[PDB]
């Protein structure tokens, strides 16, 4: 049960808030995290309306394939939190040496409102190629979004707002423009005591 | 990092909330709720 193919695997993903109250005090809160037996599948037609369908959109990407590179992740975000830094850290691995392009699209009502684009180079670690995106800063839209969500009286309202909010992550082989991984993300707010949770699904044609 | 922020991102973000806080006033698209869609039962039941 992992987000990955024979060519690229997402090893770790986490989104967080870091707070440094004084020089001796450090605090880090995770909003969501991945990575720290068979996957269920999801008909991709059930989510096309959740993501951009122009040129370079999910439907087009999925048609080009490989379809085994495509995943839907349902997150329960941990918003239970009180110098502040909002960031995202991720790690990928491959058997092949590549220059990798990582595209993160924030989408509201199925339309792209923000795209972050990062280029990553392989380091050889522990017998394979590894890609690390360390402490990537959250765009202002995300930070303001988390704040407004938190100002809401009840959790069910937050969930209602999240109905229209998705994130699409696409990782591309820079040399071949091949899709390595695509992660379509949907969110609810956690109500558990273990905090953030998630489900991973394979996206399939019908 | 390269970041492309769309023209009305502040408006758009506000639209995200009054869509739920002021539904009859907000002029925003509507959608089938995820938990009502043809998806695995686990989708709205946390592990
Ligand atoms: Cl995890």
In terms of topology, how is this protein built?
The complex is a heterodimer of chains A (206) and B (47).
Chain A: E1 9-22, E2 25-34, E3 41-43, H1 58-64, E4 70-77, E5 84-94, E6 99-108, E7 111-121, E8 123-125, E9 128-137, H2 140-150, H3 155-162, E10 165-173, E11 179-189, E12 197-204
Parallel strand pairs in A: 3-12, 4-11
Antiparallel strand pairs in A: 1-2, 1-5, 4-12, 5-9, 6-7, 6-10, 8-9, 10-11
Chain B: E1 2-5, H1 9-21
Bound molecules: chloride ion.
Chloride ion binds next to strand 2 of chain A.
Organism (chain B): Homo sapiens (Human)
Protein name (chain B): Transcriptional coactivator YAP1
Coiled coil (chain B): 34-47
Explain what the structure shows.
Chain B: The modification Phosphoserine is found at residue 9. Chain B: Belongs to the YAP1 family. Chain B: The modification Phosphothreonine is found at residue 11. The complex is a heterodimer of chains A (206) and B (47). Chain A is built from 3 helices and 12 strands. Chain A is mainly β and 206 residues long. Chain A has a single domain, classed as Coagulation Factor XIII, Chain A, domain 1. In chain A, the strands form 2 sheets. In chain A, strands 3-12-4-11-10-6-7 form a 7-stranded mixed β-sheet. In chain A, strands 2-1-5-9-8 form a 5-stranded antiparallel β-sheet, with no helix packed on it. The longest helix of chain A is centred in the last third of the chain and has 11 residues, at 140-150. Chain A is globular and about 45 Å long. Chain B is built from 1 helix and 1 strand, in the order E-H. Chain B has one helix spanning 9-21, and one strand at 2-5. Chain B starts with a strand and ends in a 26-residue tail after the last helix. Chain B has one domain (7-44): Virus Scaffolding Protein, Chain A. The longest helix of chain B has 13 residues, at 9-21. Chain A binds chain B through residues 40-43, 46, 49-50, 74, 76, 108-110, 112-118, 136-137, 139-141, 144-145, 148, 152, 157, 160-161, 163-165, 186, 188, 190-192, 197, 199, 201, and chain B through 1-6, 9, 12-13, 15-17, 19-21, 28-29, 31, 33-34, 37-40, 42-44, 46-47. Strand 7 of chain A pairs antiparallel with strand 1 of chain B. Bound molecules: chloride ion. The site of chloride ion has 4 residues of chain A, from strand 2.
């Amino acid at each position: 049960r992992s987000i990955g193919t024979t060519k690229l695997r997402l090893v770790e993903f986490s989104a967080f808030l870091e707070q440094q109250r004084d020089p001796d005090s450090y605090n880090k809160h995770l909003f969501v995290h991945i990575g720290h037996p068979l996957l269920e599948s999801v008909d991709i037609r059930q989510i096309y309306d959740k993501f951009p369908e122009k040129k370079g959109g999910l439907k087009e990407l999925f048609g080009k394939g490989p379809q085994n590179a495509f995943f839907l992740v349902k997150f329960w975000a941990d918003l239970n939190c009180n110098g502040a830094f909002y960031g995202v850290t991720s790690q990928y691995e491959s058997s092949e040496n590549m220059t990798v392009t990582c595209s993160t699209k924030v989408c509201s009502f199925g339309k792209q409102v923000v795209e972050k684009v990062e280029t990553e180079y392989a380091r050889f670690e522990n017998g394979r190629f590894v890609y690390r995106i360390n402490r990537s800063p959250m765009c202002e839209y995300m930070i303001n979004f988390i704040h407004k969500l938190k100002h809401l009286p009840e959790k069910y309202m937050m969930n209602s707002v999240l109905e229209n909010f998705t994130i699409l992550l696409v990782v591309t082989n820079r040399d071949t423009q091949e899709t390595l991984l695509c992660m379509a993300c949907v969110f609810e707010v956690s109500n558990s005591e273990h905090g953030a949770q998630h489900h991973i699904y394979r996206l399939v044609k019908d | 990092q390269i970041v492309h922020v769309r023209g009305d991102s502040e408006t758009d973000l506000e639209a995200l909330f009054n869509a739920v806080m002021n539904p009859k006033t907000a002029n925003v698209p509507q959608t089938v709720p995820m938990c009502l869609r043809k998806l695995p039962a686990s989708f709205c039941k946390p592990p």
